[PDB]
RNA sequence: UUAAGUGAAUAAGGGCGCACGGUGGAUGCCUUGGCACUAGGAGCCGAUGAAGGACGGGACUAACACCGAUAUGCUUUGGGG
């Protein structure tokens, strides 16, 4: 789903980037104290930070 | 009845033949891996950090294969349904 980390900017880049790392944590912390019914969602949030940082890459040269 | 004479059968265990089992992995048939070559490509990698490794990445992950904090994968151009 690049087709929409394509319609933004490299501030709201960042911001996105930061609100998915927290993402990550708080999954982290549901996994271990037996809750987090959809597990499918942690390599989701993988992806989405991999193709942030890519498109990032891609566009500073 | 008494004398003189002749005397089989009976296996604690063993042998030979036969019948049925147990153990053990020979023989037959078979191939997932090898051996000797032919024709064609290619004949170097490395301070822009190599060859080879250590440690990690999975919902559960001891091991092997893959991958490197963007970690069982990311973008792009083509094929395929």
Known sequence: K???IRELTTA???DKEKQL???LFN????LATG???NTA???EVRQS???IKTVL???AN
């Open 41 to 43: 969602r942690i390599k």
């Open 35 to 37: 809750q987090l019914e």
């Open 49 to 51: 930070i991999a193709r």
């Open 12 to 14: 709201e880049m960042l």
């Open 27 to 30: 999954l982290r912390f549901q």
């Open 57 to 59: 890459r891609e566009q």
């Open 21 to 23: 790392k927290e993402e």
């Open 2 to 4: 690049v087709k929409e």
